[PDB]
């Protein structure tokens, strides 16, 4: 069985490269971040533009939703992150600590904490309520490409250009595991699987790897796409069949059969690097975003 993702809408508004698209946990909204210093809110089902969220002094590399779908955190080149109230568009807090561009960000399931990764080579844990940095992890020895909390917020996985993925204890800040690939290509993306048992890692050698991080073993490899120059978001599509969704430097959205590792679909549409893809929480909806020469976000729908 293969999905039949087809282009439903194209969202246009951003004036510079789109860096990140994320669906609100309630399925209602799609949030985008861009090099144009803006956050944009769109309808997840119709692609209808909702509002523009501004305040960052430089471009944004990532955006993430809180569990109740009320707040957003954004990661900026201005060296800060910002907590936003979605309904008002107001900046609740400006998180300051990093000494270089903030690349990635995420709320924990409870949404009382924020995890960020930066070009300054560290991982930071911030208090949502106060905007205070609770912990500074000396995570890596090169830029931090991704940060993700697991299912219960007990662990953090981080990735870096230094070639490693690391598993951290949220409470202690202690590094619990360092993943070694039997090679060192820069790790450009990482995330826990929905059940927190596996980690999906992207490397700058056109490869996606599904690791059992506890046992430190690679269980699945996904290739066939282009990824050597950008930190492209990858996903677990679990609404229908089980797929691996990723952007690619050839302007296509690649979809793989999770078990067989076979490419099941290649979505054409975009005219520049597909830097970001996101999967809708309850519906078979993919949101993809492209770089400078394109600047559009696309909504794709499948029957399975």
């Amino acid at each position: 069985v293969k999905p039949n993702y087809a282009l439903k809408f194209t969202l246009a508004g951003h004036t510079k490269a789109v860096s990140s698209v994320k669906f609100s946990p309630n399925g209602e909204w799609l949030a985008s971040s861009s090099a144009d210093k803006l956050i944009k809110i769109w309808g997840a089902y119709d692609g209808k533009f909702e509002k523009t969220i501004s305040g960052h002094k430089l471009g944004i590399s990532d955006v993430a939703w809180s569990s109740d779908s009320n707040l957003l955190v954004s990661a900026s080149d201005d060296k800060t992150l910002k907590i936003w109230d979605v309904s008002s568009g107001k900046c609740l807090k400006t998180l300051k600590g990093h000494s270089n561009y903030v690349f990635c960000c995420n709320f924990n399931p409870q949404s009382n904490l924020i995890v960020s990764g930066s070009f300054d080579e560290s991982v930071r844990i911030w208090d949502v309520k106060t905007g205070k940095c609770l912990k500074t992890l000396p995570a890596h020895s090169d830029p931090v490409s991704a940060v993700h909390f697991n299912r219960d917020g007990s662990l953090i996985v981080s990735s870096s250009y230094d070639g490693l993925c690391r598993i951290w204890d949220t409470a202690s800040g202690q590094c619990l595991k360092t993943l070694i690939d039997d090679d060192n290509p820069p790790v450009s993306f990482v995330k826990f699987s929905p059940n927190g048992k596996y980690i999906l890692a992207a490397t700058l050698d056109n490869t996606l790897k599904l690791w059992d991080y506890s046992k430190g073993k690679c269980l699945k490899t996904y290739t066939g796409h282009k990824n050597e120059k950008y930190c492209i978001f990858a996903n677990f599509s679990v609404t229908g069949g089980k797929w691996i969704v990723s952007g690619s430097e050839d302007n296509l959205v690649y979809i793989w059969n999770l078990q067989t590792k076979e490419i099941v679909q290649k979505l054409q549409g975009h005219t520049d690097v597909v830097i970001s893809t996101a999967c809708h929480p309850t519906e078979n909806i993919i949101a993809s975003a492209a770089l400078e020469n394109d600047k559009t976000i696309k909504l794709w729908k499948s029957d399975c």
């Binding site: 059940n195 048992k197 599904l210 699945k220 677990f236 089980k242 078990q259």
Partner: peptide
């Protein structure tokens, strides 16, 4: 060799 990526246990 099937992997279960969604089941919590």
């Amino acid at each position: 060799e099937e992997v279960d990526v969604t089941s919590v246990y």
